[PDB]
Amino acid sequence: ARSTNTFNYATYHTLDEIYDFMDLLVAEHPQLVSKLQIGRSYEGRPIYVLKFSTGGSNRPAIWIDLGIHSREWITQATGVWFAKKFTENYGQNPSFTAILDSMDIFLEIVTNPNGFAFTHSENRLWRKTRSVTSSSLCVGVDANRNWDAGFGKAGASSSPCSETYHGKYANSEVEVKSIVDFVKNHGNFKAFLSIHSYSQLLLYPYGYTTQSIPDKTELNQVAKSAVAALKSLYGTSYKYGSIITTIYQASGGSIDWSYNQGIKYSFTFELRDTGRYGFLLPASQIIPTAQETWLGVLTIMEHTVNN
Ligand SMILES: CS(=N)(=N)C[C@@H](Cc1ccccc1)C(=O)O
Numbered sequence: 012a013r014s015t016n017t018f019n020y021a022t023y024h025t026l027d028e029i030y031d032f033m034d035l036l037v038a039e040h041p042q043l044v045s046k047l048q049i050g051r052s053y054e055g056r057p058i059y060v061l062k063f064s065t066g067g068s069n070r071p072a073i074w075i076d077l078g079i080h081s082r083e084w085i086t087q088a089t090g091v092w093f094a095k096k097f098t099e100n101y102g103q104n105p106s107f108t109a110i111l112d113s114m115d116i117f118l119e120i121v122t123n124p125n126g127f128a129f130t131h132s133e134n135r136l137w138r139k140t141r142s143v144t145s146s147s148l149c150v151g152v153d154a155n156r157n158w159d160a161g162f163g164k165a166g167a168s169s170s171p172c173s174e175t176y177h178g179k180y181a182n183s184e185v186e187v188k189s190i191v192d193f194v195k196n197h198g199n200f201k202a203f204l205s206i207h208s209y210s211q212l213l214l215y216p217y218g219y220t221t222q223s224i225p226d227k228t229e230l231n232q233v234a235k236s237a238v239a240a241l242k243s244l245y246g247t248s249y250k251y252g253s254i255i256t257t258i259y260q261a262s263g264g265s266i267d268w269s270y271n272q273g274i275k276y277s278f279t280f281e282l283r284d285t286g287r288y289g290f291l292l293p294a295s296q297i298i299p300t301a302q303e304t305w306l307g308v309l310t311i312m313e314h315t316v317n318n
Pocket residue numbers: 080155207208209210214218254258261263264265266279281
């Protein structure tokens with residue numbers, strides 16, 4: 012509340028809280044974290060990215076977004092945890108410090124602020140954005156299906172009322188477009204990670220095509236290692252593979268797009284529980300999830316700095 016050491020990482024928070032948390036963090040470690048606004052949500056809410064850097068001009072960076080799907084609260088929770096973790100581990104953890112000394116980290120905790128606010132105010136299970144209009148009384152698009160990666164292909168719905176509505180056109184959603192422009196403009200992103208929320212999977216590109224990525228051998232081993240690392244804390248078991256192969260076909264996905272942009276280390280993480288609690292994960296599981304997930308993330312980051 013008053014400082015980042017007082018903030019309760021063991022509970023779920025509102026939009027305001029996370030935003031306030033953002034400012035505390037920047038106030039406390041001004042030389043390491045900066046708060047950037049890459050856009051405004053459909054309902055005009057600021058879209059913020061927290062930039063962790065030790066200097067340099069335009070260093071190779073790591074992209075990390077959480078809460079694209081509003082109801083997946085564990086991700087926003089894990090998001091805030093990571094942010095504090097970055098400030099804590101710099102200069103203490105030999106490996107993490109090595110990473111920050113050479114690369115920057117872009118962390119977007121609340122990728123979909125409108126839906127997030129909605130999950131607090133009216134429907135806890137809301138997952139889409141809150142954009143309106145058309146020949147429909149239904150609101151929102153599935154932000155993870157609005158990307159220009161086999162956009163509109165099988166694995167997404169053209170029906171606005173649908174939970175997996177892809178939107179009118181690729182990048183129609185500001186929350187999405189804001190990232191695209193940011194990342195395209197930066198031009199030196201090396202890794203791109205998108206965090207979900209439930210089923211315990213480590214996925215790597217192509218949800219939209221059966222086509223195998225050229226870097227499949229390498230991506231597969233990294234995922235193997237990441238999953239191995241993650242399970243070392245509490246023995247949480249994750250499955251890994253390509254999207255289409257492990258789950259099902261999905262078009263307009265975040266990770267397919269990033270990979271197509273030449274960002275090789277494109278992985279999607281699906282926390283935490285395999286259905287017992289689902290999207291309504293007990294707050295008591297926040298830390299543990301954050302802790303383990305971090306191990307898998309750092310694994311991937313280490314690979315990145317090394318290749
Ligand atoms: C449980 S869920 N809705 N997070 C599953 C998440 C699986 C996915 C990962 C990457 C890319 C496209 C699809 C989705 O359907 O968006």
